[PDB]
């Protein structure tokens, strides 16, 4: 095995955990942040809907289900 | 030789700065033409605002 292969292995073992830790300051708690972001979204009952609606609420539901918008 | 080359090198840098300032002017004209596309209306000051 070349010496630089071992040196690069050591550098990777140093660098990967540090980069991962820096990427996620809130370790093991990003899921709660995702849940909070999901709850911040407004449903159809939290806004005033236009009476002359081109698409009904159920129609928008099927549109979102079919389009795989994943919102 | 070194001093005359240095003299020649200082000049041209001023020329390049002149050119890049002109390019800045050109970009300003470009963005002005872009932004004034749908802003061509003016509302006059009403007569109740006296002089």
């Amino acid at each position: 095995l070349p010496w630089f292969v071992r040196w690069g292995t050591d550098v990777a073992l140093f660098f990967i955990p540090a980069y991962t830790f820096a990427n996620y300051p809130t370790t093991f708690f990003v899921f709660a942040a995702e849940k909070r972001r999901q709850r911040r979204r407004k449903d159809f009952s939290d806004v005033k809907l236009r009476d002359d609606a081109a698409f009904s609420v159920d129609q928008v539901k099927q549109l979102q289900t079919k389009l795989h918008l994943k919102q | 030789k070194d001093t005359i080359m240095m003299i020649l090198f200082i000049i041209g840098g001023f020329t390049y700065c002149y050119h890049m300032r002109e390019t800045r002017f050109q970009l300003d004209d470009d963005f002005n033409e872009y932004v004034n596309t749908n802003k061509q209306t003016f509302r006059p000051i009403p007569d109740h605002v006296k002089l």
Binding site: P2, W3, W7, F14, A18, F21, A22, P25 | -
Partner: protein, 92 residues
């Protein structure tokens, strides 16, 4: 033999100190970020970093909640007699 070059081996002695320094610094920065990120669900930009119009929009709702409702719902007997009331927005 596949040993390291001699100049590299000498400087490699200081690397664990660098690693522990990085660990401590990452911990410090992460704790600062987490303490800031908890009360505000985001990293809130500094108030002075926004424009004049932005500054009004970010503080309008707080003004309405803290100084408009108690004033529009004010009654003579609502106030505390201990004279320790809420302070004015501008202090004179």
């Amino acid at each position: 033999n596949t040993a390291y070059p001699t100049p590299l081996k000498t400087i490699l002695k200081t690397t664990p100190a660098f690693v522990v320094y990085f660990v401590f610094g990452l911990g410090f920065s992460t704790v600062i970020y987490d303490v800031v990120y908890h009360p505000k669900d985001r990293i809130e930009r500094f108030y002075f970093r926004s424009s004049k119009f932005e500054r009004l929009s970010r503080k309008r709702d707080e003004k309405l909640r803290h100084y408009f409702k108690p004033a529009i719902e004010w009654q003579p007997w609502y106030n505390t007699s201990t004279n320790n009331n809420t302070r004015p927005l501008l202090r004179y």
